[PDB]
Each structure stands twice: as structure tokens, then as C-alpha cells.
């Protein structure tokens, strides 16, 4: 089993919506 | 079209070239998985049997592989006797290759013909023919028929015993012949005869290559026919103790692992003791590792209670010494399994002398922490994750050692080389998620590691940044320091991805640090790229800002509280507008919008209630005393327009609680934490309802005391514990103040205001289903009446009946059983008179159980009414343990209703 | 060697009539499309008239003629019903037929105009077209005499009778400016323009095309009101599919018998 079950921070678990957000925001890659 | 594909593939079959014949033959399985129609399946299979009876042996191998691929459609075959007659009729050929291929196909047809005596006989004869390739094909065919039959199995066990004693055929063919005895789990006497045969086999052939397959078939036989598990275990322990072959001992390892994983409760105390003695007496680190893995699995299971069940000290028990010495052994994996055994036994059993074992286990635990922290190997990280599992399990099972283990993990956070830090950050996040004091105990050092991050890491900076920001929020569950968040912003603006800082922001929204959340959402809002993304980030920003305003609250000041409520409600209004802007036909934020709307309505109800609480003193008792006599009040005992508004608020709050129950039962897809959180919000609403009902309204009729268990720390969140403590406080205060005053509500308004202030002082917890959603399950639910392509109503003669033929197919976005597995579908259909008792007579529901992911059900409706009717259906998906879970489309169909002219004329004559 | 890619578009739709244009298809195919509208579209019409007692001055055969020429509503129950000639039942059964009744006694001094409204039907999905304006007149009855009859309506097509022909009128044409020169105009200026013509007012005659085919067929389908025109087209095409499928199966068996 994994170390922590309520893990929001994992790659393959996350769904289509903020996958698209991930694509955009990794393309952006900065904050002011 | 399906028929068209069928006979064009038939023409490809009738083509001259065997290449094109192979083309069509291997093209059938696509047609099977496209058209599941059974007549088509039967005709295609019949043409297959024809071409297999007359093909040129490569077509035969192609047809064989087609059957072996599309095996699952075999059960819907009608003309079984003709199919089997062709396929069996080609077995009399003199070509050994053709005989072998045919026997393999019979092994494939085992699913539909398990009783064919002639097939049994042909397999048994070709089993002792001489042609090699058909001998091994006969072995494979026996291996399938013995799985799906019984009398064939007893025939084959007699024949196999005869052959093995009869000493013909070489050792390789003996290896092929042994694994037939796995399918002897049909009866106990067959199992015993095969067991005697296998014991004789191992004693007759002391060879490694013999013994390995013999033992593995013997143990699968016992694990299937679980009657001789103790004999199996003691035989394996004998061979692990006695036989000096290292490979055979590794077989014993990988087999006792299987038995320990399958049937743990059958493990006995003498078995455990014998394995422990073997693990002490072994010289080899690898075999000791395997035995320790076996003991780790058994310790995780129930059998530790068997080993420490009395009717010999626990210290006198040989397990403890082995566990201690192997936990302090030099080798890393051995130490990992030792600390696994120690953690399991410590959490499981509670005897008086085990405190020394607790101390030894925790100290050897930071030994594993330092070793895996500065090892940096893949196996080292595996043992590290094992140690962190030991941490989570030990701390949750026993809260006694929590502060010690947290401070040790912080010392390792000092002493780590920036690879294991993410892992132990997750682990200590879990531990502080259980017990809150672990963060505000040592806020400083985690911030020090945070400031050394930037020049400490170069490869997984994003990952460790996200983890340590999560735990800094968990540590500063209280109001976050401006200097600390400025340092956080400094490092994030130094080096971060937008997706990274977004994940820090999401963790901030999860824990409740809404000021930091507001800042991060503001930055991400100012960048974004796309429109629904912008509106989504903007809505999140507004809820974070409103929650910041709500946390900006002062105790026992009602005017400032309602001002803060109004400000926060303005900001939720902006946020919910932007959320409706973010809403799209794809990925529709239904749960998010509905949940934030219910939170809005809860806060509006709170503001209205505290407004009426303040207006309690607006001469309502004077209005009552002016309208009627104060003594023996006609409207109520100490009557009040304020009491009327209390009744209105009570009914409104109960309706709000009903809406929360509706939201939860329509959601159904979230995990345990989110569903629990929604239950707590409904708990708060019902708490306010019961408080205003049992204190302002009739307390003698209330007569309710919370004479039940409450306040246990079995919760899954510190947030949940905080709301639960608030609930206990409100219950004790209302139970104290139930009978003290008259209904004039002197300090009753003060008690209600205190409850409101506490319930708003506990901030919020934005949650996972409000964020990333998983196990997206749906019901298509296509009805099939007379097809109404437009909204034109469907005419029925109204004298006979009407049939519906509803159909549903269930779909899953991922692994369907993440949290809840669908079990049954309660469909619910009712009628309504479209032209205005609302046609609520037919109130049908039916519990169809989807055996496969498609289902259909026939409904009959009776009606004799002139007007149009609307027909409504519901899915009512009910899960494994049994819950309502109202999801589904809830579609509606219009139906017309006309009558016979002869019937109308007869009614006119009537 | 293979079929082209024809195109379909529709200009306007009305309950009584529809207008559409077809392109990139053969004149033979288009003529067969008009003929399959005319002939084999199955509808429901009154066929079996039993007369208990007639005392009208119109004779019984005439009454049966007008009853057979009454139109009816045949939306989809015509597709549900089976042919009377093929359905194995004693006389007519409700799977292959529809029952009608007509009893009129003119007992009033004024002439009682027997109308299509007075036909009592057995199935609500089938009525005279007029009901669901002035009704269709059947016979004018003087005071004193009566007319009592029973009727059965069945399913047929226009190869049998124009009463089973449902299309009130087809207007099928092409080449509105005789560019294919199928006709020769001695006085093309005196020849009036078509409504689809795009030629000049001075010319009124497209130039001759040495290489071309007749194309861009214009269709105006006027129903009699029994069915929707789109349903009529779909039924005609479906019957064409069925007939070609039967011809294929029978001729394949003929080839199998030959070989
Ligand atoms: Zn019939």
C-alpha cells in the first residue's frame, strides 16, 4: 500500500479536467 | 450490414488462396466482438467447423487461435452436436500435427462440451500414443477437461498413476504430465488418492526438477481442495527444514507466502514455532528474508492472536527473539521485515510485558529511517516505504508513541539527503492529520527545511515543495503567519511551476488556509489561458476570500459577526456567479455549484436567525401582551411573532437538511472523507434545527437528553473532531438550559448565538470531490417505447395496456470499484396527468440486477384517461452494502391517449 | 463502372406537399423514384363492403365505389398490418384488417347529408382523413329511407387501385432551360419560361451542351392527405429495398440451380 491514502498529489489518479489545466499550466510554468 | 460482413467473409473463405482464407478466418473475432447476435455466432461457428474439417493445416491452426481468442462467446452456440461432430470427425486423420491441433481445439471447447465420452476416450488414447507433438497436445487437452469435469478427472488420475509408475516416457514428459493433478479439487477421496500419489512421487524421484513442480501442483491442489492444509503445511516445513537444496527452499518460501496470503486462520502455533526455529537456524540471508516476509504476512493477519492465545511467557516465545535480532540485523531488507513484524505484533496484541518491545521497535525504527534515508537505492526506497507503513499503522493503532515518532521523523528531516523527504513528509502529514499537536509543537524546523529547499534540490523540487507546503498548512492549521507565508511566496516566486503552486493552493483549500489560498488563486487568475479555467480559478478565489473574511471573526460580538457574514456572502455571490460561468456541458460542476449554493443558504439562514435573535427584544412580548392577556396567553405561553419566526426558521433549517441529504445521495461518487464532510454539514444543520426546536419550542414535549456515546476520537479529520466537539458543547449547553427559563427566551438567544459563533469559528474544509473526481459512473437509461423522435405524444388505444421496455447500460470512467461497486438498479416509474390525484396510481418500482453491464426490464402501464400523460423513470442505483443513492437521468416520455370511435359511440348511447 | 454520389436537398415542407431537388443521379433512377411514389406505396383503404339494407336511390355498387374511394389515415399501422391475401386467418382478422360501420336513418324532414364523419371506426389510429373543415359527402338521403352497412379496410397499393394510390400528384422535371436540348423549340421566344429557368429575358434559351447529362431533378410531391409526404418517400424507398432484395435472393437461387 502507499504511504498516505488521502493523497491528492499523484499524477495518474487525477482526471481529465485538470489534466487539461495541467497541460496549459505546465506550458505556462511561472507565477509572478 | 452484419449479414453482409458474414457472407463476404464466407466468400473470402471460399477463395482459392490459403492466405485469403487465413485472412477471413482471423477476421472472425472482430466480428464476434462487434455483433453479439447469437444466430450470427452459430452460423459463423458452423462455417469455421466446415473449414477446419477441410483445411490445409495452417487454416486449422488459424481457426484454433480464433477459438482460443474469442472463447467468451462460446456459451451461445446452438448446433453443438454438429459443430462437435465436424471437429471430432477430423481426429481420425493419420497426420500427427492435425491430431494435435484437433486435440488443442477440444481443450478449447472444454467450456461447452465437458461430458463428451468419445472426446474423453480419444484424449486418453492419444495420451499414450507415441507421436510427441500430439502427446503434449493431449496433455493440454486433459488439463482443460480435468478442470471442467470430474469423472474424466478420476479416469485421468488412474491413468497418470499407471503411467508414472509404468516408467515409460522421459522426465520432460513427466514434467508435462504432473500439473494435471491441480484439478482434483472435485472430491475429497480423489484429493486423498492424488495426495498419496504425490507423496509417493516426491519420495520416488528425489530430483530438484521433479520436486519443484510436484510441490507446486500439490500445494495448488490443497489450496483449492482446502481439506489437508495442515498436512500440506507440515510437509512444506519438513522440506524447508530438511532438504539442503537452496532452490527448493526458495520454492518453500514462495509457496508458504501463497498459503499465508490465502488461508491465514488455518495457520497453527506449532507451524509458526517450527518456521521460527528454521528462520533462526538458517545461515543464508536470502532465505531468512523469505521466511521473514512469510512471518510479516502472518503477523499482519489474525494468526498472531493464535500464537499468543493462552490455553510460556510471550518473551519466552521464540518469535520475539527472532524478530528482535532480525530487526537489528545488518541487512536492510531483513531489518525492514523485522520492524514489520514488531509493528504488527505491537498494534495487534496488548499484554503487560510488550512495552519493552514497543521501545525496541521504535528505536530500531529510526535505525531503519537513518539507513534508508542515506542509502538511496530503489530497494532502499521500497524498504523506506515499508517503514513508513509501519509508522502510519503504529501511530494510528497506538496514539501513545506519537510525539516520540514525530520528533524522530523531524530529526530525520534534518538529516536527510532530499530523496526520502517527500515520503516521510507524506507519512508525517498522515500522523499530524490524525493528531493535531505535532505541527504547532515544532512549526520552526519544517520552515527551516522549507527555506533550505531552494538550494537543496534540483530534480523533484516541485514534488518536495508540494509535500512540505501541505505539511506546513497541516502544522499551521491555525491562522497562518504573514512572515511565514511571505517566505513561502518568496520561494514559490523564485522557482515553481504554475501547476505546482496550484497544487499548494489546492492543499491550502483542503486544510483551510484561505488567505494563502486567496493569494495563490489571485496569481493564477492573473495568468491562466482559457475561459472556463479562468472562471473556475476566479470562483475559487472568491470562496477563499469569503472564508478569510469568515475566519476574521470575534467571539461574542453579534453585530460584527453579522457584518462579516454579509461580506462573506457577497463574496460567495460573486464566486457562485463565476462558477456558473465556468459551468460547461462537458465536465459539469453539478456537485460544486450545488454544494456551494447549500453553504450559501446555510449562512443566509444563520444570518436570518441571528437577526431574529437580535430582534427578540423588538417588543414581541409587548405585542403579545397588547393583543391578548399575558397571563394564559392565547397564541402561546409567552407568545411571540418572534416565536412564529422561530417556527419559520426551524422549518427552513429542516428543509435545508433535507437538501443536504439529497445532495449526498445524488453525489454517491465521492470518497469516504468527502461523504463524511457532507454528513457533518447536514449534522450542523440538524443540530441547529434540534436546538431551536427543543429550546424555543416546547421543552416538556422535547424531553430529550443525549444519553448515548459521543466524543470518541474515531474521526478521520481534525476538522471533523472540531465540529464534533462543538456539537458536544452545544448539546451539553442545551441540556443544561432545557428547563431553566420560560419560553420568553432570556438567555436562549445567547445560547443559540454561542452555537452560531462556534459553528462559524470552525472555518470549512474544501474537499476532494469538490476537486478532482474519480469513479465517474453513469447510467444511460434509454427507454424504448414507440419511438418519439420529436416531442409528439404516443397514442395508445387506452383499452388494453401499454408496454415500456426500458433499458440501461452502466459506464465507468476508470476502474469501477474504486469506492462503491454497483450491485442492483431499482428503477422507479410513475405517471402524471399532463392535462390538468395527479395520476399517482401507478407507482411502480422494480429491482433489476445487472448480471452484465446491460439490462432491460418490461413495464406495464394502465390508464383510461382522455388527457396527455407524462411518464417518469428513475435509476435508484443501490450499491453492495445497500444504500439508496438517487442518481440517474430521470427522463420523461409524453404519452397520448385516444379511444375507439365505437367505444365513444357506445358511451354516447349509454 | 460503379455508382456515383448523388445529392439530396429540400426547399420547403408543407403538410399537403413538399418540394425537393436531387442531383448527380440517372434519369432512369429519378423516373423510377416517381413511379415508386405512384405505384407500390402501401396504404389502408376500404375494400369489403357488406350492405344489410339499402333504400337510397343511389345503388349499392355505387355506395361501395364511393366507400372504397374514401381516403383514410395510415401513418404507421399500415406498416404494422399484414396483407389480407397472405395473412392466414378466417375471413379478415384485426392483424390484417380494420372494421368500419355505417348506419344512417334520415328521419328528419331536411335531407341528411351522409358524411365521412359518420363512419364508425374500430381502431382510433385509422379514421377518414377529413376528421383529424367540411366533411366528405357520401350520399344525400331523403326522409324515410336508410342505409345500414358494415365495412372492412385492408392494405393495398396502386398496382391494384388508385384508391390505394395515396399520392395526389407528382411534378418531376429537369433542365429548366433545355440545355440538354431534349426538346427543339421552333419558337423559343414564344415558349413561356419555366419557374426554375435562369436564362435571360432576351434569350430564354440556354446554349446547347455537346457533352452533358440530364441533371438537377426538381420534385413536387402532393399527398392526398392520408400520409405525410416524407413518410410516403420513406415507405416507397423501403419497398424498393425489399423488392430488390427479393429479386437478388431469387436470382441467386436461379444461378445456384443453373450451376
Ligand atoms: Zn388476418
Curated annotation (Swiss-Prot), chain A:
Regions crossing the membrane: none
Domain of life: Eukaryota
Summary of the tissues where the protein is detected: Expressed in limb bud, craniofacial primordia and skin.
Location within or outside the cell: Nucleus
Assembly behavior: Component of the 19S proteasome regulatory particle complex. The 26S proteasome consists of a 20S core particle (CP) and two 19S regulatory subunits (RP). The regulatory particle is made of a lid composed of 9 subunits including SEM1, a base containing 6 ATPases and few additional components. Belongs to the TREX-2 complex (transcription and export complex 2), composed of at least ENY2, GANP, PCID2, SEM1, and either centrin CETN2 or CETN3. Component of the homologous recombination repair (HR) complex composed of ERCC5/XPG, BRCA2, PALB2, DSS1 and RAD51. Interacts with the C-terminal of BRCA2.
Annotated function: Component of the 26S proteasome, a multiprotein complex involved in the ATP-dependent degradation of ubiquitinated proteins. This complex plays a key role in the maintenance of protein homeostasis by removing misfolded or damaged proteins, which could impair cellular functions, and by removing proteins whose functions are no longer required. Therefore, the proteasome participates in numerous cellular processes, including cell cycle progression, apoptosis, or DNA damage repair.
Family as reported in the entry's similarity comment: Belongs to the DSS1/SEM1 family.
Protein name, as recorded: 26S proteasome complex subunit SEM1
Organism: Homo sapiens
Gene that specifies this protein: SEM1
From Swiss-Prot, chain B:
Entry keywords, A to Z: Chromosome, Cytoplasm, DNA damage, Nucleus, Phosphoprotein
Protein's UniProt keywords contain Repeat: no
Localisation: Nucleus; Chromosome; Cytoplasm
GO biological process terms, semicolon-separated: cellular response to ionizing radiation; DNA damage checkpoint signaling; regulation of transcription elongation by RNA polymerase II; RNA polymerase II transcription initiation surveillance; snRNA 3'-end processing; snRNA processing
Keyword Iron set for record: no
UniProt modified residues of type Phosphoserine: 313, 784
GO cellular component, one term: nuclear body
InterPro entries: ARM-type_fold, INTS7, INTS7_C, INTS7_HB, INTS7_N
Entry similarity comment: Belongs to the Integrator subunit 7 family.
Description of how the protein assembles with itself and partners: Component of the Integrator complex, composed of core subunits INTS1, INTS2, INTS3, INTS4, INTS5, INTS6, INTS7, INTS8, INTS9/RC74, INTS10, INTS11/CPSF3L, INTS12, INTS13, INTS14 and INTS15. The core complex associates with protein phosphatase 2A subunits PPP2CA and PPP2R1A, to form the Integrator-PP2A (INTAC) complex. Interacts with NABP2.
Physiological role: Component of the integrator complex, a multiprotein complex that terminates RNA polymerase II (Pol II) transcription in the promoter-proximal region of genes.
Protein name: Integrator complex subunit 7
Taxonomic path: Eukaryota, Metazoa, Chordata, Craniata, Vertebrata
Curated annotation (Swiss-Prot), chain C:
Secretion signal span: none
Sites bearing Phosphoserine, chain numbering: 123, 245
Positions of Zn(2+) binding: 87, 89, 93, 96
Subcellular compartments: Nucleus
InterPro entries: DNA-dir_RNA_pol_30-40kDasu_CS, DNA-dir_RNA_pol_insert, DNA-dir_RNA_pol_RpoA/D/Rpb3, RBP11-like, RNAP_Rpo3/Rpb3/RPAC1, RNApol_insert_sf, Rpo3/RPB3_RNA_Pol_subunit
Annotated region (Disordered), positions in chain: 191-214
GO terms assigned for molecular function: DNA binding; DNA-directed RNA polymerase activity; protein dimerization activity
PROSITE patterns: RNA_POL_D_30KD (PS00446)
Gene3D superfamilies: DNA-directed RNA polymerase, insert domain (2.170.120.12), RNA polymerase, RBP11-like subunit (3.30.1360.10)
Gene Ontology terms describing biological process: transcription by RNA polymerase II
GO CC, alphabetical: cytosol; nucleoplasm; nucleus; RNA polymerase II, core complex
Keywords (A to Z) from UniProt: DNA-directed RNA polymerase, Nucleus, Phosphoprotein, Transcription
NCBIfam families per UniProt: PRK00783.1
Job description of the protein: Core component of RNA polymerase II (Pol II), a DNA-dependent RNA polymerase which synthesizes mRNA precursors and many functional non-coding RNAs using the four ribonucleoside triphosphates as substrates.
Quaternary context: Component of the RNA polymerase II (Pol II) core complex consisting of 12 subunits: a ten-subunit catalytic core composed of POLR2A/RPB1, POLR2B/RPB2, POLR2C/RPB3, POLR2I/RPB9, POLR2J/RPB11, POLR2E/RPABC1, POLR2F/RPABC2, POLR2H/RPABC3, POLR2K/RPABC4 and POLR2L/RPABC5 and a mobile stalk composed of two subunits POLR2D/RPB4 and POLR2G/RPB7, protruding from the core and functioning primarily in transcription initiation. Part of Pol II(G) complex, in which Pol II core associates with an additional subunit POLR2M; unlike conventional Pol II, Pol II(G) functions as a transcriptional repressor.
Family note: Belongs to the archaeal Rpo3/eukaryotic RPB3 RNA polymerase subunit family.
Name this protein carries in UniProt: DNA-directed RNA polymerase II subunit RPB3
